[PDB]
Design a protein around this ligand. Sequence first.
Ligand SMILES: [Zn+2]
Ligand SMILES: [Zn+2]
Lengths: 90, 73, 215, 423
Amino acid sequence: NFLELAESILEYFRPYLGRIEIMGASRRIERIYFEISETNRAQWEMPQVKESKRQFIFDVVNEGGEAEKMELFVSFCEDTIFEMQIAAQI
Amino acid sequence: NFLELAESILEYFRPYLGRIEIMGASRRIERIYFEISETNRAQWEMPQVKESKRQFIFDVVNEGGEAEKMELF
Amino acid sequence: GVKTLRTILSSVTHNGKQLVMTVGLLAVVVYLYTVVAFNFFRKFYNKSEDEDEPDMKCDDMMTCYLFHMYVGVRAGGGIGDEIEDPAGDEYELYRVVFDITFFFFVIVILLAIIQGLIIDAFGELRDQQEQVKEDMETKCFICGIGSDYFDTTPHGFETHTLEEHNLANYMFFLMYLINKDETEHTGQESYVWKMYQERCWDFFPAGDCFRKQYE
Amino acid sequence: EVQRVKFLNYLSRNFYTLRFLALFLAFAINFILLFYKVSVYYFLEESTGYMEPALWCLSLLHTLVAFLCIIGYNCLKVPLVIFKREKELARKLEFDGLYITEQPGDDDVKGQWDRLVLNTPSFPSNYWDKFVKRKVLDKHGDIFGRERIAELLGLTWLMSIDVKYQIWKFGVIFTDNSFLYLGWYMVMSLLGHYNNFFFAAHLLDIAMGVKTLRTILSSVTHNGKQLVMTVGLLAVVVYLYTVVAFNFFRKFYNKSEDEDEPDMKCDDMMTCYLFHMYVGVRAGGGIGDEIEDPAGDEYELYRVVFDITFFFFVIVILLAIIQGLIIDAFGELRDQQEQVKEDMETKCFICGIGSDYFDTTPHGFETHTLEEHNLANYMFFLMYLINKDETEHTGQESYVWKMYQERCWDFFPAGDCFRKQYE
Ligand SMILES: [Zn+2]
Ligand SMILES: [Zn+2]
């Protein structure tokens, strides 16, 4: 109910509240809720970045798909972070 | 804790301690721990032998893959 | 430039190694045929226009082998089309066998093995752009749990993407962790940062998702 | 004398390099060879005059290396080949026991040569179990004439070697679809001296030299049984066309250059059929391209159908069904190397349990390889066992050895892994 009266708040922040899941200290699954910069939410959904992601998923699924998956994935996130920093320069 | 203190032992023998699994006398799964000859860990990991396994796995997965699998292996 | 061509040419290039080596196989075989031709049928290798003229007759081996790599590989109709047809010679029969064996072992097989290596190639890329979409729609990506567990609720797997993980979300989260000062972390945040620095990456879910945990 | 048992090992040690070294020479010599000209067989000797004599040592050098490799091959793969043929037999006498019961039958005499060797005293020389032959009589022969079975069994260093084991092994080595090649390889190198032109055939080693080409033949060869018969379909079909052309259109089969000349007109059938096997299968443009076009003859309308049907039913279909069967063929191996990797990454290999059970822990299935099995580990274990003296075994180690001798092989896990057991 309370959430039901809260709706005008949540509708604004679903776009840019951030879920994830992590296997945390507890050795179960804490989930967390990071804030997201709006510029990022926009930045990850239009340009080279999208297809960059596609190249990523192709590169992982088709190849290296063992324990390396998370590794390579973080390499992607990091590269992509770097790219967005470069966008920030512009 | 005790295992934690012995690490410099185990780090040396993981390379060549040998696990396997067998369906033993108990008719469950005893697992055993054979010692590995040191030449063998390398001998199986470089030459014709490495590709030789690949010739094997193709010989089994693609063909004869019934009870023969352990037989042939 | 244009994306489609990148795909089309990619289709060739991913097998390009194999394909070039096939071209090597072409050259060699036709060389074997230039040897056999040099040792026997050089009579027939008149370049005469039409006859009783001092045509060089490719009896210099380099020119003979060039005579098969050119206007032999090019044949279509075989090597025999490009050289005067034997008739009544005792060597004629051995020769026509030569021409057929060359026509199969080169232009019917080998150009077909270029063609088919290209076709299999194109086929391969289609097969991989198949499976890539096929795995992300089945297995999650991060959890690995697969699009079947998540069928218990409506379009559940889709939710397991968009909300339970997406994939981006871990990205923005990593961005968050980067931009935050070390004091600013909540415990999960410091933890994730910690593993991220020690780079074990166990923290990303692995088959435990969240939904499977709990009930 | 002693170094022979050293250099021999030196020879075996380099054998893979040794052939690539040889094929490097088969290019090197034969590359010079393309300089020949008739004048006779003149050597062009372009630029340097010392190039031909440089080739002469090479023709000696190559055949020597060609002979040289097999001797290490004789000390490499050959004993591995002779091994498994013993083991293929050595178990077979002690289980199926066929010589004691069956016989192999008229075909696969490779198994029927075995009737010879088994009589030999020195038979199980390579299986590391000399007492097999003793072990067998303990079985089987008690059922009947235990020494009725015995009749089936039982510097002088040159004198020291046996006979029947040797005659048999030499032949088994001959049965090999590799030794026979290198033996075929050296022989042409032996012919490389009688003429350097036959020396050229050594290039074919490239076909099984570099790995990719091996696939490129494998791209074809397994379907070759299915393919060659298409050529059988080809000749036969065109033969039907020669029967038709012979009976009708032989008028048109002028070989005339251009006309009103005594061209033979391929009306002998043997050439009439050859005429379609050649410059017919070769057509490209069909048979009609290679014969003067009909125009206004009453047979023409009946003839032009003969061409189009011959054009579809041979060059459009049948070459395609050679074109295409090669494509599928090449397309097949990709599908199998798919599934091969696909099954070892899903199902285990030993347990059978599959890469999904093991998802309960991180990269678990990967662990199920590396630690829970890793395939190989059973090998090292089986090596561990063979090296042990029988007293030395722990109970599993005996139990494993026991089943290994009775060869039921139930002990390797089968769907029970370890992880599924317990919790
Ligand atoms: Zn997930
Ligand atoms: Zn297993």
